[PDB]
Amino acid sequence: SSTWLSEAEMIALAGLLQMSQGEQTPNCVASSLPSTSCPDPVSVSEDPGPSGDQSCSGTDT
Amino acid sequence: QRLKVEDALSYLDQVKLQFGSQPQVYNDFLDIMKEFKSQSIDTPGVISRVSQLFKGHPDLIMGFNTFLPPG
């Protein structure tokens, strides 16, 4: 849908911005405190209790 | 919010401007990035090669290291 400049510059640049950050959690593997084991979970748990009428809240109490 | 890609592109144009009479350094720069983007060299290789790829203009280099993580 969105056409940008040449693919060559798009790739080289991609790696540029990815390298300047690819030394911790973005690409590299280090420090599991920020975000390493949770890239993009589905966010869901068994109905526990008062926490919204979405789909998780015990049963009635 | 920290690095920003738009700023990087602006830097790309800046390089193409200065070395407008020498599109060689440009092609070599992006080419290198692709080699690292695919499978060939590592981070230290890109930083070193590029540093020597711009031998003569400490300006672009000075602003280039800004992108990479300081410390």
From Swiss-Prot, chain A:
This is Histone deacetylase complex subunit SAP25. Residues 23-38, 52-61 have a biased composition (Polar residues). The chain holds residues 126 to 186 of 186 of the full protein. It is found in: Nucleus; Cytoplasm. Widely expressed. Its main location: nucleus. GO terms for cellular component: cytoplasm; nucleus. Residues 23-61 are annotated as: Disordered. May be a component of the mSIN3A corepressor complex. Interacts with SIN3A and HDAC2. Involved in the transcriptional repression mediated by the mSIN3A but not the N-CoR corepressor complex. One of its GO terms (biological process) is negative regulation of DNA-templated transcription.
Curated annotation (Swiss-Prot), chain B:
Residues 1-71 form the PAH domain. There is a cross-link at K4, K16 (Glycyl lysine isopeptide (Lys-Gly) (interchain with G-Cter in SUMO2)). Widely expressed. Highest levels in testis, lung and thymus. Expressed at relatively high levels throughout brain development. In adult mice, expression is high in neurogenic regions such as the subventricular zone, rostral migratory stream, olfactory bulb and dentate gyrus. Residues 1-71 are annotated as: Interaction with HCFC1. Disruption phenotype: SIN3A knockdown causes a significant decrease in the amount of cortical progenitors in the proliferative zone at the peak of neurogenesis, and results in altered neuronal identity and aberrant corticocortical projections. SUMO1 sumoylated by TOPORS. Probably desumoylated by SENP2. It is found in: Nucleus; Nucleus, Nucleolus. Acts as a transcriptional repressor. Corepressor for REST. Interacts with MXI1 to repress MYC responsive genes and antagonize MYC oncogenic activities. Also interacts with MXD1-MAX heterodimers to repress transcription by tethering SIN3A to DNA. Acts cooperatively with OGT to repress transcription in parallel with histone deacetylation. Involved in the control of the circadian rhythms. Required for the transcriptional repression of circadian target genes, such as PER1, mediated by the large PER complex through histone deacetylation. Interacts with ARID4B, BRMS1L, HCFC1, HDAC1, HDAC2, MXI1, SAP30L, SAP130, SFPQ and TOPORS. Interacts with OGT (via TPRs 1-6); the interaction mediates transcriptional repression in parallel with histone deacetylase. Interacts with BAZ2A, MXD1, MXD3, MXD4, MBD2, DACH1, NCOR1, NR4A2, REST, RLIM, SAP30, SETDB1, SMYD2, and SUDS3. Interacts with PHF12 in a complex composed of HDAC1, PHF12 and SAP30. Interacts with TET1; the interaction recruits SIN3A to gene promoters. The large PER complex involved in the histone deacetylation is composed of at least HDAC1, PER2, SFPQ and SIN3A. This is Paired amphipathic helix protein Sin3a. It comes from Mus musculus. The gene is Sin3a.
